[PDB]
Amino acid sequence: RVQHFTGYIEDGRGIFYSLPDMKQGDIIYASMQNTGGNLDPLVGIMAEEIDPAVSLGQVLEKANDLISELTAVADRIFLGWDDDGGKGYSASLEFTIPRDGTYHIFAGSTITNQRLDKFQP
Amino acid sequence: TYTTGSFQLILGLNAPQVISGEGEPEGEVFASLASLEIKPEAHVQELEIRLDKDTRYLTQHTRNLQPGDTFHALVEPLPRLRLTDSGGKPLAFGLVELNYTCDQDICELVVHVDGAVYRLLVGINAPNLRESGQTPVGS
Ligand SMILES: [Ca+2]
Numbered sequence A: 001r002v003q004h005f006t007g008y009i010e011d012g013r014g015i016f017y018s019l020p021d022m023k024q025g026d027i028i029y030a031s032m033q034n035t036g037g038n039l040d041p042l043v044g045i046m047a048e049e050i051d052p053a054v055s056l057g058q059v060l061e062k063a064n065d066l067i068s069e070l071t072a073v074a075d076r077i078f079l080g081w082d083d084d085g086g087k088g089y090s091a092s093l094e095f096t097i098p099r100d101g102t103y104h105i106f107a108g109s110t111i112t113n114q115r116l117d118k119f120q121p
Numbered sequence B: 001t002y003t004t005g006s007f008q009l010i011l012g013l014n015a016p017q018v019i020s021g022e023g024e025p026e027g028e029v030f031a032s033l034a035s036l037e038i039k040p041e042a043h044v045q046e047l048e049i050r051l052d053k054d055t056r057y058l059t060q061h062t063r064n065l066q067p068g069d070t071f072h073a074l075v076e077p078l079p080r081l082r083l084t085d086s087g088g089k090p091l092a093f094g095l096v097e098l099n100y101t102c103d104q105d106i107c108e109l110v111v112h113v114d115g116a117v118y119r120l121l122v123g124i125n126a127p128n129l130r131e132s133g134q135t136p137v138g139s
Helices: A053-061 A067-077 B016-020
Strands: A015-022 A027-032 A041-046 A080-082 A091-096 A101-109 B043-050 B057-061 B070-076 B080-085 B090-093 B097-101 B109-114 B117-124
Touching (some): A027 A041, A027 A101, A041 A067, A041 A091, A053 A067, B070 B109, B080 B097, B090 B097
Antiparallel strands (some): A015 A101, A027 A091, A041 A101, B043 B117, B057 B109, B070 B117
């Protein structure tokens, strides 16, 4: 069971995907690759759909000032996530469905630095 | 003189086609790297740096790190210290001392020191940077 999706991310505004009525014992797989621009993929899975923008914004506001804070916030927002598990900066995720019900998949952009003259997440 | 460069080594056991140089991998392995049996060789380097009025930000590039390696750095005159990769994605932050461990196949690191003259000490596979003792060793 394989499905494809394509989208566009603007200024760290993510896209939610719905997984209706999964069964306990199922295994979810995810992979996200960059096809244009400077996007750095991030993927997370959760039960109740809530916008991570308000929580992730505080991480940018506090500018291990980046990695530890991002990990601590992600371990609260999501049940499972991956940043750079694939080839390059691409993400890959394996998640065993805990109980019976529906879940949500969140795709978006992580917080990164891409300069060597100064530090600016 | 001696010579330097990269090489490819093919080893065979009771496989007479190896001497042709075209032996494809087969069977179950029989030999392994010897260096993995002991502790890795440390490299230590010390630098003196100065942050002028117009040069308050400084960056340095490191050589490539193999997977499983470790990185240590410390500064003693306090400025801020952090570590990022070549793109710049942050990896560690100073507590001044810093520590990191290599996960990817090839890691290229950049050390940021930003704020006067300071001493910067850096080492690879050398957790003893607090009390080195030996003069800077290795490459
Ligand atoms: Ca990533």
